[PDB]
Amino acid sequence: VFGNLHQLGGVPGTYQLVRSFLNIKLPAPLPGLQDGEVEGHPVWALIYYCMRCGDLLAASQVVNRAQHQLGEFKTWFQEYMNSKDRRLSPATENKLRLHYRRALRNNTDPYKRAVYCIIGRCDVTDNQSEVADKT
Amino acid sequence: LVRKSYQALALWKLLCEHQFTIIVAELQKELQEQLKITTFKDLVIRDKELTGALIASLINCYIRDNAAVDGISLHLQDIC
């Protein structure tokens, strides 16, 4: 971000810096393919990267604003965040896991899968298909 | 000719997707006068060099997203 552009149009907030990474950096040669995008922005990729950065809170906020419909997950994100990040509810974690296996596991947008898998610790057999790009 | 028109239109289909306007404003230089008075037929019976430069900018810059970008690179390779 600290190098030309726009200089990004908006304020230097962390969120925008990541939007820049996702948009300017190599998610697009000349933009496209299989993300879920609203208003020109891959939300799931954003949450994933923000999470990658360590900005969990911001990632949570993005989800809140998201316009999405897996919303139960939204709940499970927030408490994961609230606690020590080992979100352990004696309650639902089990429920989240079932949904992952049935709905999410066989399908979806790579980043969405990443967020579910990583936050949830959903499927211990380990690896994320499309978006592991670095060692 | 029909194929050529297809190609030009295809590029435009690409451009419509996004952030075309910003690049255009920044890019245009002395050549610009020639560019602005370019007709569709001019594209139909192409003015190759300018488009190549522009397309390169589309790819170099972030504007093209995903699959689109791959397509131009293919295009530059094929007919450029």
Swiss-Prot record, chain A:
Q: Where in the cell is it found?
A: Nucleus membrane; Nucleus, Nuclear pore complex; Nucleus envelope
The family classification in the record reads:
Belongs to the nucleoporin interacting component (NIC) family.
Quaternary structure annotation from Swiss-Prot or TrEMBL? Part of the nuclear pore complex (NPC). Component of the p62 complex, a complex composed of NUP62 and NUP54. Forms a complex with NUP35, NUP155, NUP205 and lamin B; the interaction with NUP35 is direct. Does not interact with TPR. Interacts with SMAD4 and IPO7; translocates SMAD4 to the nucleus through the NPC upon BMP7 stimulation resulting in activation of SMAD4 signaling.
What disease is mentioned for this protein?
A: Nephrotic syndrome 12: A form of nephrotic syndrome, a renal disease clinically characterized by severe proteinuria, resulting in complications such as hypoalbuminemia, hyperlipidemia and edema. Kidney biopsies show non-specific histologic changes such as focal segmental glomerulosclerosis and diffuse mesangial proliferation. Some affected individuals have an inherited steroid-resistant form and progress to end-stage renal failure. NPHS12 inheritance is autosomal recessive.
**Free-text function comment from the UniProt entry:** Plays a role in the nuclear pore complex (NPC) assembly and/or maintenance. May anchor nucleoporins, but not NUP153 and TPR, to the NPC. During renal development, regulates podocyte migration and proliferation through SMAD4 signaling.
What this protein is called in its record is Nuclear pore complex protein Nup93
What organism is recorded for this protein? Homo sapiens
Q: Which residues of the full protein are shown?
A: 274 to 410 of 819
Curated annotation (Swiss-Prot), chain B:
Reported tissue expression: Expressed in all tissues tested, including heart, brain, placenta, lung, liver, skeletal muscle, kidney and pancreas.
Protein modification: Phosphorylated. Phosphorylation and dephosphorylation may be important for the function of NUP155 and may play a role in the reversible disassembly of the nuclear pore complex during mitosis.
Where in or outside the cell it occurs: the entry states:
Nucleus, Nuclear pore complex; Nucleus membrane
Name the disease. Answer: Atrial fibrillation, familial, 15: A familial form of atrial fibrillation, a common sustained cardiac rhythm disturbance. Atrial fibrillation is characterized by disorganized atrial electrical activity and ineffective atrial contraction promoting blood stasis in the atria and reduces ventricular filling. It can result in palpitations, syncope, thromboembolic stroke, and congestive heart failure.
Quaternary data: Interacts with GLE1. Able to form a heterotrimer with GLE1 and NUP42 in vitro. Forms a complex with NUP35, NUP93, NUP205 and lamin B.
Similarity field: Belongs to the non-repetitive/WGA-negative nucleoporin family.
Record function comment: Essential component of nuclear pore complex. Could be essessential for embryogenesis. Nucleoporins may be involved both in binding and translocating proteins during nucleocytoplasmic transport.
Q: What is this protein called?
A: Nuclear pore complex protein Nup155
- Span within the full-length protein is 784 to 863 of 1391
